[PDB]
């Protein structure tokens, strides 16, 4: 197959209609505006291709066969690598001054007319909390179908060691924290009463249910317990790669926000602020619980931590 | 106009035919291979858009009106910025293992079938020593090196009747090397004195070779030099008097032409590594602006540079 | 000179005291925390070395000799290059998980104890609106001495073409805008309800530029930084940027805005890193002037006025 | 603890003696030369801190307890991230023209830490520096430690899984039917070349000879073990070790890219280097996935140690 025919360059390298040239006088810098956005859209299609493939492995129960954990993590890492290059790609728009942009600004749509469908589809597919025709039907499917957060949440609920009749991680953890706080108290007094309130709040299921309703939490109480199990026992073979998956989900969340930030700055630069946009807020949250390592429940001769499934 | 309609996404986002899926079983990683190369081709079109516009300013004599020097420099810098991102874009291909590449390798063309027309057009347009007609035009038309060469020959201060830069420079170097040789012979018999006499005879041969027009003409014929002797003299004038207003922006242009040359080679290197990584297993000749690198490596001391009287061309533009 | 002796590696490569190891159990990741911040501090010293040198060229009147404009622009570009690498340097902190950071968090100072003097000195020296002793004296000097904004402001007031008796840029500009809006209004008067509404909005924007009293009030509210004459001079360089005399000064204004974007992007990544492990534009006016959508055909024309192509010293 | 006192900034921010300023006239650009190299040396110390800690896990036999595989991989990835930034750090030296460098060149070079790092990875000064350099050359390199560990790879044992025996049988039979398929001009020529490459993998005498000529680094058993991790990378037990091999190759590419940019910078102002050549080599054997010996799910591939 010929290079240009395999790549279908007859479509890609023939889609550059300078609106300034079409509606009057050609403005040289408008070509950079067209190519930079066409390049962003190519990478959004690849990010969607990886995200949808990983979403499928989860929805079709293939994540249960743990031979696929390398594939899932590898593809999630690739999404972060692509996202790192998209943040870098803003350096090319920087080469165009705001004075030169104003020369072709008249031949462009308002801020309303200029909005990406693929980025909206990607945000919905990851699980970011709240176009016509085929675009409107494809957007409806993104909102209807299970988000990556919902699929990861269901998977986190099945985490080994959670079962109260088996390992009973939450029961052991609560007991260890309670007993550790007793011996710590037997001995600063102001900082203890504050520290105790924070650690014990983790076991308040009613508080977590209220925070979920206020949009402050996303994961279910059982998925939150399962994520913490992977956190503490990350060195145990069974949780080594799942820890990398949680790590990657947080990294993707940081990059999604860094891209939205640079894009926002670029709009304010050429034309003249979210904090809760983190889908995996709970994964960041669990990293902040300052439980002393010597209070983490010890690991018994329980074969789950070193035996895999298929 | 709608975002996708202005960007013609109906062509761009509908040009991904996975050959594995077409000829049998779909191989997931093949989509990354298609998009990475399509993304490289989008940036090659933008690099060609900037390069051809700058080439036009030169060929149509607009470079004579110096009000355009900001435009030329700005666009040449943009080419280097885009080139910096294309070297970074290789990090995305790194996410695909050589083992996974082999799964879709059977559904692909040989090393011969896989060759970029736009990169070849770009190399020819910079001046590296229907598709067939467009390639013929790239080789026939004046390269960026040829246009820059002609422009360097018109550099003010070169004229022997006027400033006579080359005559002053040769005189200053000759007299400076004489007093340096004397200083070396004044040193008492030492190990460092014998090393200094040897390093002087080598340093003197390098600096004086700059004034051998017959040697430069011979090296041009052997493919070792690219710029004409007058363009080489003109480039050195911009180098030494870069602080003088008239040469501030032209110095940035020469700087940018060297930067582009370094990036073109770094891209060829990463691409070569990628081929040897997926298929199994730093050239100076590839530098178009070798002479601009060459002039930076002469090392003439600042106090030997001929002095400028402020009753001269260095501050009046055209 | 010996490599390690020239670089004084006996100081640099002997300044790593792991506080976890000192106060009890050594935590491996704490070495990365020490080196990453020591590396940031080396680059802050270099950014201060370039910034102070450029500030000096301005304060000591050397910017008047325009042969130094390449030097000023080159060093300002270098500050942006270094700043671009400091934003990238945050990828190294990313390699340390927040869980591992908590293992050495107990052996560290509060949010008050952890604050950079060099970054504070740099912010003050550019002109952004715990330490004691020699540090407190050096911080007082940063706030007292002329900022890079003040030095650039004074230089912008001297911009050629501003003088009312000479080129009179502001007078010409106001006249041209007023007369251009007259002919545009006439064309419109011939439904076109969106055109008449967009005209009254366009007119309000362009004419606001000539309201000196509004600019003086915005300066007081902290919304503007440059004086009205420095604001006029910056716009002169903007419109006549292609004219040889203003080619390099345009790059300088461009660089001052770029440095401002990078200073904020660094503060952003740093803030995100603190929230990850624990749970402001000085040149606002330069960004502002880029947003005025004046049609290029209304910009006052340049006849045989020798200032645009003759330099000074 | 105060920020500058914890960081010992009294040493770091007071180690800049401009030799131009000391021996006469101060040259502004010389400060950039000092800081850029001091910054490189800070990162070489961190790269050595990570590399030595990983080397210790191997020499200490702690790698046998597979709970440490996350730690080893994580630290090896960190070394590649730091290395990526050192290649980027060359953009700061680019801001200094060769003409300005010549102004301080009269008042003026090989890194001990980079030499120590090259020796510690396994790339084949006087006083305390000479003693520390001797230790780097004497002590077991990261290649030697990885080599010993690769020899213990499960599935290699002929009495057990017998990977090499199965693999040779599968390749031999697959090449027979491929040759037959061809017999029905460029394909016949490319087959004779492809067959020679794949069959050479089972020539232990050829590998032993190439090791002696400096063309190979890993022992035949470590080479067999690396290929086992390559093919069965999806199997849980080999998921993280595959990331380790991947990282060792990535570090090797970055070490070379740094040596390249450094060399270009010296010329601007004035395969043998690959330790893990074998890991690149094994990736280049174009074996079809349907020839890989199948795994019965009554095996070691899912139980850790
Ligand atoms: C067989 C299993 N993959 C078990 C499982 C669930 N969540 C996990 C988290 C980490 C490791 C394993 C799991 C499954 O239930 O899908
Ligand atoms: C008028 C002019 N632009 C002069 C010129 C030519 N080459 C140069 C190099 C540096 C500075 C100026 C020149 C011309 O002759 O085209
Ligand atoms: C001689 C001069 N440099 C003139 C000057 C002032 N501001 C400027 C802006 C752009 C160009 C020139 C100027 C001076 O008075 O400093
Ligand atoms: C118990 C063990 N760590 C097993 C081992 C050795 N080499 C390996 C390679 C990949 C996976 C496992 C191994 C050991 O014997 O070191």
Domain ranges of chain C: 3-164+221-308
Instruction: Please give the structure tokens belonging to residue B313.
Output: 């061309």
How remote is the CA of residue A74 from the centroid of ligand 4, in Å?
22
Ligand 3 close to Cβ of residue C161 (< 6 A): no
CATH class, range A3-162+211-305: mainly alpha
Count of all residues that appear for chain B in the document: 318
With both helix axes pointing from N to C terminus, report the angle between A98-105 and A237-271 in degrees, rounded to the nearest 10: 70
Select from A211, A208, A287 the least CA-distant residue to A250.
A287
Return the ligand 3 atom nearest residue C63 CA. Answer: 16
Which among D57, D59, D63, D145 is the best mutation to test ligand 4's pocket, defined by most ligand atoms within 8 Å of the CB?
A: D63
Ligand 3 close to Cβ of residue C37 (< 6 A): no
Q: What is the CATH number of domain D3-157+215-302?
A: 1.20.58.480
Query: Exposed, middle or buried: residue B41 (CB in 10 Å: 0-12, 13-18, 19+)?
Result: buried
Instruction: Please give the structure tokens belonging to residue A240.
Output: 């080594």
User: For chains A and B, what is the number of CB pairs under 8 angstroms?
Assistant: 151
| The three-state (H, E, C) secondary structure of chain C, written as one string | CCHHHHCCHHHHCCCCCCHHHHCCCCCCCHHHHHHHHHHHHHHHHHHHHHHHHHHHHHHCCHHHCHHHHHHHHHHHHHHHHHHHHHHHCHHHHCCCCHHHHHHHHCCCCCCCCCCCHHHHHHHHHHCCCCCCCHHHHHHHHHHHCCCHHHHHHHHHHCCCCCCCCCCCHHHHHHHHHHHHHHHHHHHHCCCCHHHHHHHHHHHHHHHHCCCHHHHHHHHHCCCCCCCHHHHHHHHHHHHCCCCHHHHHHHHHHHHHHHHHHHHHHHHHHHHHHHHHHHCCCCCHHHHHHHCCCCCHHHCCCCCCCHHHCECCC
What is the Cα–Cα distance from C199 to C171, expressed in whole angstroms? Answer: 22
Ligand 3 close to Cβ of residue C160 (< 6 A): yes
Contact D98 B296 (CB under 8 A): yes
User: For chains A and D, what is the number of CB pairs under 8 angstroms?
Assistant: 47
Can you list the pairs that D8-12 forms with residues at least 24 positions away whose Cβ atoms lie under 8 Å? Answer: D8/C15, D8/C16, D8/C17, D8/C38, D9/C15, D9/C38, D9/C41, D11/C11, D11/C12, D11/C14, D11/C15, D12/C11, D12/C12, D12/C15, D12/C38, D12/C41, D12/C42
State which residue of chain B sits closest to D282, comparing Cα positions: B280
Cβ-based contacts of A240 with chain D (< 8 Å): 69-70, 239-240
* Closest approach of A70 to chain B, Cα-based (Å): 12
List residues bridging with B316 in a β-sheet.
C310
Contact B99 D283 (CB under 8 A): yes
List residues bridging with C310 in a β-sheet.
B316
How remote is the CA of residue A257 from the centroid of ligand 4, in Å?
40
Which among A62, A65, A66, A246 is the best mutation to test ligand 1's pocket, defined by most ligand atoms within 8 Å of the CB?
A: A66
Is the CATH number of domain C3-164+221-308 3.40.50.300?
no
Angle at CA A258, nearest 5°, toward A255 and A262? 140
How remote is the CA of residue B249 from the centroid of ligand 2, in Å?
11
State which residue of chain B sits closest to D286, comparing Cα positions: B102
Q: Name the CA dihedral angle for C255, C258, C264, C267, rounded to a multiple of 10 degrees.
A: -70
Which among C159, C163, C234 is the best mutation to test ligand 3's pocket, defined by most ligand atoms within 8 Å of the CB?
A: C159
Return the ligand 3 atom nearest residue C158 CA. Answer: 6
Q: What is the DSSP string of chain B?
A: --HHHHTTHHHHTT----HHHHTSS--TTHHHHHHHHHHHHHHHHHHHHHHHHHHHHHHTTGGGSGGGHHHHHHHHHHHHHHHHHHHHTHHHHTTS-HHHHHHHHTTS--TTT---HHHHHHHHHHT---HHHHHHHHHHSPPHHHHHHHHHHT-TT--TTTT-HHHHHHHHHHHHHHHHHHHHHHS-S-HHHHHHHHHHHHHHHHHHHTT-HHHHHHHHHTTS--S-HHHHHHHHHHHHTTTSHHHHHHHHHHHHHHHHHHHHHHHHHHHHHHHHHHH----GGG-TTHHHHHHHTS---GGGSPP--SSSGGGB--
Contact A241 D242 (CB under 8 A): no
CA-to-CA separations, D65 to A161, A298, B44, B141, D53, in angstroms, rounded: 21, 17, 51, 67, 16
Cβ-based contacts of A308 with chain D (< 8 Å): 236-237, 302-303
User: For chains B and C, what is the number of CB pairs under 8 angstroms?
Assistant: 46
Q: Is D157 helix (H, G, I), strand (E, B) or coil?
A: coil
Ligand 4 close to Cβ of residue D149 (< 6 A): yes
Of the partner residues C241, C276, C291, the one whose CB lies closest to the CB of residue A284: C276
Contact A39 B34 (CB under 8 A): no
Count of all residues that appear for chain D in the document: 305
Q: Is A217 annotated as a binding residue?
A: no
Instruction: Please give the structure tokens belonging to residue C250.
Output: 């345009």
State which residue of chain B sits closest to C240, comparing Cα positions: B67
Ligand closest to Cα of C307 equals 3
Ligand 4 close to Cβ of residue D153 (< 6 A): yes
Ligand closest to Cα of A161 equals 1
Contact C293 A105 (CB under 8 A): yes
Contact A234 D70 (CB under 8 A): yes
Ligand closest to Cα of D157 equals 4
How remote is the CA of residue D150 from the centroid of ligand 4, in Å?
7
Which among C58, C66, C234 is the best mutation to test ligand 3's pocket, defined by most ligand atoms within 8 Å of the CB?
A: C66
CA-to-CA separations, C17 to A199, C21, C117, in angstroms, rounded: 31, 8, 20
Q: Is C270 annotated as a binding residue?
A: yes
State which residue of chain D sits closest to B106, comparing Cα positions: D288
List residues bridging with B210 in a β-sheet.
none
Ligand closest to Cα of A154 equals 1
CA-to-CA separations, A217 to A151, A278, C174, D5, in angstroms, rounded: 16, 10, 56, 40
Count of all residues that appear for chain A in the document: 310
| Resolution of the experimental structure, in angstroms | 2.9
List residues bridging with A307 in a β-sheet.
D303
Of the partner residues B34, B39, B53, the one whose CB lies closest to the CB of residue A39: B39
Q: Is the dihedral of CA C161, C164, C168, C169 positive or negative?
A: positive
Contact B34 A81 (CB under 8 A): no
How remote is the CA of residue D145 from the centroid of ligand 4, in Å?
12
What is the Cα–Cα distance from B96 to B92, expressed in whole angstroms? Answer: 8
Task: Tell me which DSSP letter residue D303 carries.
Answer: B
Instruction: Spell C21-48 as b/e; 16+ CB within 10 A means b.
Output: beeeeebbbbbbbbbbbbbbbbbbbbbb
What is the Cα–Cα distance from D216 to D206, expressed in whole angstroms? Answer: 10
Count of all residues that appear for chain C in the document: 313
Cβ-based contacts of D69 with chain A (< 8 Å): 237, 240
Q: Is C36 annotated as a binding residue?
A: yes
Angle at CA D82, nearest 5°, toward D77 and D85? 130
Interface partners of chain A (CB pairs < 8 Å, 3 or more) are: B, C, D
List residues bridging with D303 in a β-sheet.
A307
Is the CATH number of domain B3-159+222-315 1.20.58.480?
yes
């Amino acid at each position: 197959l010929i290079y240009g025919n395999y790549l279908h360059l007859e479509k890609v390298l023939n889609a550059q209609e300078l609106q300034s040239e079409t509606k009057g006088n050609k403005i040289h810098d408008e070509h950079l505006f067209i190519i930079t956005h066409q390049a962003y859209e190519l990478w959004f299609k690849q990010i969607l291709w990886e995200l949808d493939s990983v979403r499928e492995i989860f929805q079709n129960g293939h994540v249960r066969d743990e031979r696929n954990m390398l594939k899932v993590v590898s593809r999630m890492h690739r999404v972060s690598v692509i996202l790192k290059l998209l943040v870098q790609q803003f350096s090319i728009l920087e080469t165009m001054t705001a004075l030169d942009f104003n020369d072709f600004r008249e031949y462009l749509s308002p801020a309303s007319g200029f909005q990406s469908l693929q980025f909206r589809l990607l945000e919905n597919k990851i699980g970011v909390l709240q176009f016509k025709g085929e675009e409107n039907e494809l957007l409806l499917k993104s909102e209807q179908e299970k988000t990556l957060l919902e699929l990861v949440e269901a998977w986190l609920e099945r985490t080994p060691g959670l079962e109260p009749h088996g390992f009973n991680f939450w029961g052991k953890l609560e007991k260890n924290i309670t007993r550790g706080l007793e011996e710590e108290f037997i001995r600063q007094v102001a900082e203890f009463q504050k520290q105790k309130e924070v650690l014990l709040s983790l076991f308040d299921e009613k508080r977590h249910e209220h925070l979920l309703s206020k949009g402050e939490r996303r994961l279910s109480y059982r998925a939150l317990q399962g994520a913490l199990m992977i956190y503490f026992y990350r060195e145990e073979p069974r949780f080594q790669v799942p820890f990398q998956l949680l790590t990657s989900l947080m990294d993707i969340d940081s990059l999604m926000t860094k891209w939205r930030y640079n894009h926002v700055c670029m709009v304010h630069r050429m034309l003249g602020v979210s904090d809760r946009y983190k889908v995996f807020v709970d994964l960041f949250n669990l990293s902040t619980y300052l439980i002393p390592r010597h209070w983490i429940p010890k690991m018994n001769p329980t074969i789950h931590k070193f035996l895999e499934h298929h």
